[PDB]
Design an enzyme around this catalytic site. Structure first.
Site, PDB file in Angstrom:
ATOM      1  CG  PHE A 186      -2.198   6.974  18.646  1.00 42.40           C
ATOM      2  CD1 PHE A 186      -3.210   6.758  17.732  1.00 42.40           C
ATOM      3  CD2 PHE A 186      -1.117   7.759  18.261  1.00 42.40           C
ATOM      4  CE1 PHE A 186      -3.144   7.298  16.460  1.00 42.40           C
ATOM      5  CE2 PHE A 186      -1.063   8.298  16.991  1.00 42.40           C
ATOM      6  CZ  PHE A 186      -2.082   8.073  16.100  1.00 42.40           C
ATOM      7  CG  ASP A 188       0.487   6.333  23.126  1.00 42.46           C
ATOM      8  OD1 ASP A 188       0.189   6.811  24.237  1.00 42.46           O
ATOM      9  OD2 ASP A 188       1.010   7.009  22.213  1.00 42.46           O
ATOM     10  CB  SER A 190       1.883   8.636  25.849  1.00 44.00           C
ATOM     11  OG  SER A 190       0.520   8.999  26.039  1.00 44.00           O
ATOM     12  CD  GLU A 258      -4.672  16.050  40.773  1.00 47.76           C
ATOM     13  OE1 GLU A 258      -4.925  14.843  40.587  1.00 47.76           O
ATOM     14  OE2 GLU A 258      -5.491  16.843  41.245  1.00 47.76           O
ATOM     15  CG  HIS A 351     -13.024  16.823  37.507  1.00 46.70           C
ATOM     16  ND1 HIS A 351     -12.781  17.889  36.678  1.00 46.70           N
ATOM     17  CD2 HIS A 351     -11.891  16.089  37.490  1.00 46.70           C
ATOM     18  CE1 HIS A 351     -11.560  17.778  36.176  1.00 46.70           C
ATOM     19  NE2 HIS A 351     -10.955  16.770  36.750  1.00 46.70           N
TER      20      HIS A 351
HETATM   21  C1  HEM Z   1      -8.361  13.932  42.873  1.00 48.52           C
HETATM   22  C2  HEM Z   1      -8.581  13.681  41.577  1.00 48.52           C
HETATM   23  C3  HEM Z   1      -8.397  14.638  40.464  1.00 48.52           C
HETATM   24  C4  HEM Z   1      -7.838  15.869  40.488  1.00 48.52           C
HETATM   25  C5  HEM Z   1      -7.181  16.471  41.704  1.00 48.52           C
HETATM   26  C6  HEM Z   1      -7.984  16.475  39.205  1.00 48.52           C
HETATM   27  C7  HEM Z   1      -7.445  17.745  38.885  1.00 48.52           C
HETATM   28  C8  HEM Z   1      -7.450  18.277  37.605  1.00 48.52           C
HETATM   29  C9  HEM Z   1      -6.927  19.572  37.236  1.00 48.52           C
HETATM   30  C10 HEM Z   1      -6.238  20.563  38.145  1.00 48.52           C
HETATM   31  C11 HEM Z   1      -7.109  19.741  35.917  1.00 48.52           C
HETATM   32  C12 HEM Z   1      -6.667  20.939  35.114  1.00 48.52           C
HETATM   33  C13 HEM Z   1      -7.785  21.947  35.088  1.00 48.52           C
HETATM   34  C14 HEM Z   1      -7.660  23.072  34.093  1.00 48.52           C
HETATM   35  O1  HEM Z   1      -6.730  23.895  34.258  1.00 48.52           O
HETATM   36  O2  HEM Z   1      -8.532  23.246  33.182  1.00 48.52           O
HETATM   37  C15 HEM Z   1      -7.786  18.569  35.466  1.00 48.52           C
HETATM   38  C16 HEM Z   1      -8.108  18.375  34.170  1.00 48.52           C
HETATM   39  C17 HEM Z   1      -8.685  17.164  33.757  1.00 48.52           C
HETATM   40  N1  HEM Z   1      -9.133  16.142  34.488  1.00 48.52           N
HETATM   41 FE1  HEM Z   1      -9.102  15.970  36.398  1.00 48.52          FE
HETATM   42  N2  HEM Z   1      -8.640  15.629  38.405  1.00 48.52           N
HETATM   43  C18 HEM Z   1      -8.950  14.513  39.090  1.00 48.52           C
HETATM   44  C19 HEM Z   1      -9.632  13.394  38.637  1.00 48.52           C
HETATM   45  C20 HEM Z   1     -10.018  13.181  37.335  1.00 48.52           C
HETATM   46  C21 HEM Z   1     -10.716  12.065  36.869  1.00 48.52           C
HETATM   47  C22 HEM Z   1     -11.178  10.933  37.759  1.00 48.52           C
HETATM   48  C23 HEM Z   1     -10.881  12.231  35.506  1.00 48.52           C
HETATM   49  C24 HEM Z   1     -11.569  11.389  34.530  1.00 48.52           C
HETATM   50  C25 HEM Z   1     -12.243  10.277  34.808  1.00 48.52           C
HETATM   51  C26 HEM Z   1     -10.259  13.481  35.170  1.00 48.52           C
HETATM   52  C27 HEM Z   1     -10.193  14.018  33.905  1.00 48.52           C
HETATM   53  C28 HEM Z   1      -9.632  15.258  33.605  1.00 48.52           C
HETATM   54  C29 HEM Z   1      -9.422  15.727  32.259  1.00 48.52           C
HETATM   55  C30 HEM Z   1      -9.771  15.148  30.919  1.00 48.52           C
HETATM   56  C31 HEM Z   1      -8.847  16.900  32.328  1.00 48.52           C
HETATM   57  C32 HEM Z   1      -8.466  17.762  31.118  1.00 48.52           C
HETATM   58  C33 HEM Z   1      -7.009  17.368  30.695  1.00 48.52           C
HETATM   59  C34 HEM Z   1      -6.481  18.174  29.511  1.00 48.52           C
HETATM   60  O3  HEM Z   1      -6.682  17.846  28.277  1.00 48.52           O
HETATM   61  O4  HEM Z   1      -5.802  19.203  29.791  1.00 48.52           O
HETATM   62  N3  HEM Z   1      -9.769  14.011  36.305  1.00 48.52           N
HETATM   63  N4  HEM Z   1      -8.018  17.677  36.507  1.00 48.52           N
HETATM   64 CA   LIG Z   2      -1.338   8.662  24.536  1.00 47.38          CA
END
Ligand code: HEM
Ligand SMILES: [Ca+2]
Ligand SMILES: *[C@@H]1O[C@H](CO)[C@@H](O[C@@H]2O[C@H](CO)[C@@H](O)[C@H](O)[C@H]2NC(C)=O)[C@H](O)[C@H]1NC(C)=O
Ligand SMILES: *[C@@H]1O[C@H](CO)[C@@H](O)[C@H](O)[C@H]1NC(C)=O
Ligand SMILES: *[C@@H]1O[C@H](CO)[C@@H](O)[C@H](O)[C@H]1NC(C)=O
Ligand SMILES: *[C@@H]1O[C@H](CO)[C@@H](O)[C@H](O)[C@H]1NC(C)=O
EC number: 1.11.1.7
Length: 595
Positions: A186, A188, A190, A258, A351
């Site tokens: 949700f 929410d 969190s 992060e 990303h």
């Molecule tokens: C400097 C900016 C950001 C950094 C350093 C970053 C870094 C990361 C890292 C390290 C992961 C984990 C990767 C893995 O082990 O599979 C991750 C997952 C993710 N990031 Fe990014 N990210 C950034 C920006 C964003 C943005 C702008 C979005 C969306 C608009 C986003 C959405 C996601 C999502 C959905 C996940 C998967 C989360 C989950 O369910 O585990 N990130 N990101």
């Molecule tokens: Ca939530």
């Protein structure tokens, strides 16, 4: 009959369907099925998992095992050949602020998190991948291709650990492996309040009865609050400057530090809760701590919902907004509100929106200091640049006045993320987010690109020329076919992100469909949605309609000049107005009870 009936979380949870407030865990939202959307359960499968062995082993795991008769490419080779680029000139989004990127990460963190297995690193378990690059069990290292520069400098692999799964931990059988969503599905807040009772209480100020969230006691921002430090060692935020020794922040979500602009966003969100709790005490001195916490929390959750659905989603989904997310028609308790596995990849589109630098700006919105602009990679796990170098106000101005990266078929992911990523316990700024994303698709048993095209009712290209037409790019389609040999085998993250963007949006058709559906479900499947009749009063709702991000900034920084539309690309001073121009949130309708 159909499943083993797996019950991973504590099966014991009492509901009290009287309650006017959400639980912290997300339990009890749905009355018929009270675990739906709750943290620490399996991500939903919209389509069945696709593993090399039918059960658990990712595609790519076994060299001799093809996918549909072809070998899957190395994730890092895909990254190098398709995702990488040198020239940062001409790459920025002329119509999206940097805040657009940032809100996306915030919403994401509210919705989903699939933590790697063995959530606390014990002994020397991880001498496997880190040291010797030996694939085994939850060790699934990203191997470098030949002729990759990192081979010369960093070794033979980047370490990669498989995501946690529900029924057991290291073992499992007689069913496909399902990864965990450790936060509530949700929308929410969190990320502010936590998804487990335990963290939720540690985040609170119980010492006073004012319903406040804990604040930093060792540092302040011109009197405005900071998040508490997380005093767990070893700290990555300490590791990145052992001279400053400024640890990571403690937030409702684990990932809050992060990068510095995420920590910034979390700080704004904390202050707003404390601010709301004070106004509610004034109007209702008879409300106790618990009441003030819940009522503030409730307002804050409504705020994030509104900003997201009214401001953010329309300029992500563009023309497809109305198709997937028609105007609200009320809570529907037949809708599944759980985050799907596929969504946790679809939302990674962000990303390709992250630019290579971050700026600090002063009150005339000009470079703040001699080193006002910094490479993004120096800002991972970086709290000291907040605590010791200007607080959040300068960074927030950058979020307003600087631009997101624009997604580009020839310039997908900045080398700051693709080559210089830092991860905790890895010590170096030398990882690749793109490669990680692709490895994770495989880890999670993701169906490939044409499966999802099919799901979304879209053509399924089988030839190079088919793929060229869909991507509207000949060379990209060729590189993809050279690596994957068939569009059926293209990983969803890269396949989805490869497609040109829909009119007025920032994702292509496939991603608009996948994101569009998920968000529809988040809203329609939520009993505590802000607009659900009964959640708020008529008059409370009239006040909430006047929330804005601009106004969040005015009330929770000492910034007095802001755009009206913060996600747009805004230039100072023309597109900027004084804070007095902007609607406030009117808390009058929360007055105990009327005459
Ligand atoms: C400097 C900016 C950001 C950094 C350093 C970053 C870094 C990361 C890292 C390290 C992961 C984990 C990767 C893995 O082990 O599979 C991750 C997952 C993710 N990031 Fe990014 N990210 C950034 C920006 C964003 C943005 C702008 C979005 C969306 C608009 C986003 C959405 C996601 C999502 C959905 C996940 C998967 C989360 C989950 O369910 O585990 N990130 N990101
Ligand atoms: Ca939530
Ligand atoms: C670690 O943080 C310190 C500050 O905590 C950084 O240095 C301060 O920054 C500049 C250095 O030229 C000056 O204002 C001060 O002389 C420094 N203070 C101290 C205590 O030395 C330092 O550069 C940081 N290092 C890294 C690699 O981030
Ligand atoms: C920039 O984006 C907004 C979408 O929120 C739109 O209303 C505005 O017209 C855009 N400007 C352009 C590209 O014409
Ligand atoms: C909690 O409340 C009191 C009163 O506002 C404040 O002085 C105290 O420092 C707070 N504690 C924390 C750790 O936030
Ligand atoms: C509620 O949602 C489902 C979609 O999952 C839909 O098929 C059904 O008709 C809806 N029912 C109501 C109560 O509107």
């Amino acid at each position: 009959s159909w499943e083993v009936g797996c019950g991973a979380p504590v099966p014991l949870v009492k509901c009290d369907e009287n309650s006017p407030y959400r639980t912290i865990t997300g339990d009890c939202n749905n009355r018929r099925s009270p675990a739906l959307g709750a943290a620490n359960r399996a991500l939903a499968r919209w389509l069945p998992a696709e593993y090399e062995d039918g059960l658990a082993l990712p595609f790519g795991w076994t060299q001799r095992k093809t996918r549909n008769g072809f070998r899957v490419p190395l994730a890092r080779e895909v990254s190098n050949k398709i995702v990488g680029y040198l020239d940062e000139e001409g790459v920025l989004d002329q119509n999206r602020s940097l805040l657009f990127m940032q809100w996306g990460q915030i919403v994401d963190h509210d919705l989903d998190f699939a933590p790697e297995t063995e959530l606390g690193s014990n002994e020397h378990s991880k001498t496997q991948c880190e040291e010797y690059c030996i694939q085994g069990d939850n060790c699934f290292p990203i191997m470098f291709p030949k002729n990759d520069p990192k081979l010369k400098t960093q070794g033979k692999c980047m370490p990669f650990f498989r995501a946690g799964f529900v029924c057991p931990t290291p073992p499992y059988q007689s069913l496909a492996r399902e990864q965990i969503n450790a936060v509530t599905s949700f929308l929410d807040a969190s990320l502010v309040y936590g998804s487990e009772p335990s963290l939720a209480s540690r985040l609170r100020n119980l010492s006073s009865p004012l319903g406040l969230m804990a604040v930093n006691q060792e540092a302040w921002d011109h009197g405005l609050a900071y998040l508490p430090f997380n005093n767990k060692k070893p700290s990555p935020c300490e590791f990145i400057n052992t001279t400053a020794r400024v640890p990571c922040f403690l937030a409702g979500d684990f990932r809050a530090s992060e990068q510095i602009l995420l920590a910034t966003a979390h700080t704004l969100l904390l202050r707003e809760h404390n601010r709301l709790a004070r106004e509610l005490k004034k109007l209702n001195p008879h409300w106790n701590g618990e009441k003030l916490y819940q009522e503030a929390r409730k307002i804050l959750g409504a705020f994030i919902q509104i900003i997201t659905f009214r401001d953010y989603l329309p300029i992500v989904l563009g023309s497809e907004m109305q198709k997937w997310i028609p105007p609200y028609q009320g809570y529907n308790n037949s809708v599944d509100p759980r985050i799907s596995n596929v969504f946790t990849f679809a939302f990674r589109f962000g990303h390709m929106e992250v630019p290579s630098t971050v700026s600090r700006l002063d009150e005339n919105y000009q470079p703040w200091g001699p080193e006002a602009e910094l490479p993004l990679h120096t800002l991972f796990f970086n709290t000291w640049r907040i605590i010791k170098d200007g607080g959040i106000d300068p960074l927030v101005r950058g979020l307003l006045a600087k631009k997101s990266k624009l997604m580009n078929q020839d310039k997908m992911v900045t080398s700051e993320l693709r080559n210089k990523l830092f991860q905790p316990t890895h010590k170096i700024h030398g990882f690749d987010l793109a490669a990680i994303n692709l490895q994770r698709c495989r880890d999670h048993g993701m169906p490939g690109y044409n499966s999802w095209r099919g799901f979304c009712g879209l053509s399924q290209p089988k030839t190079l020329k088919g793929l060229q037409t869909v991507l509207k790019n000949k060379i990209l389609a060729k590189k993809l076919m050279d690596l994957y040999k068939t569009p059926d085998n293209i990983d969803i993250w890269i396949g989805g992100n490869a497609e040109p963007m829909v009119e007025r949006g920032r994702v292509g058709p496939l991603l608009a469909c996948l994101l569009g559906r998920q968000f529809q479900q988040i809203r329609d499947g939520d009993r505590f949605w802000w607009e659900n009749p009964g959640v708020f009063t008529e008059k409370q709702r009239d006040s909430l309609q006047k929330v804005s991000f601009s106004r969040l900034i005015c009330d929770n920084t000492h910034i007095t000049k802001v755009p009206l539309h913060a996600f747009q690309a805004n230039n100072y001073p023309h597109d900027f107005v004084d804070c007095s121009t902007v609607d406030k949130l009117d808390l009058s309708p929360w007055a105990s009870r009327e005459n």
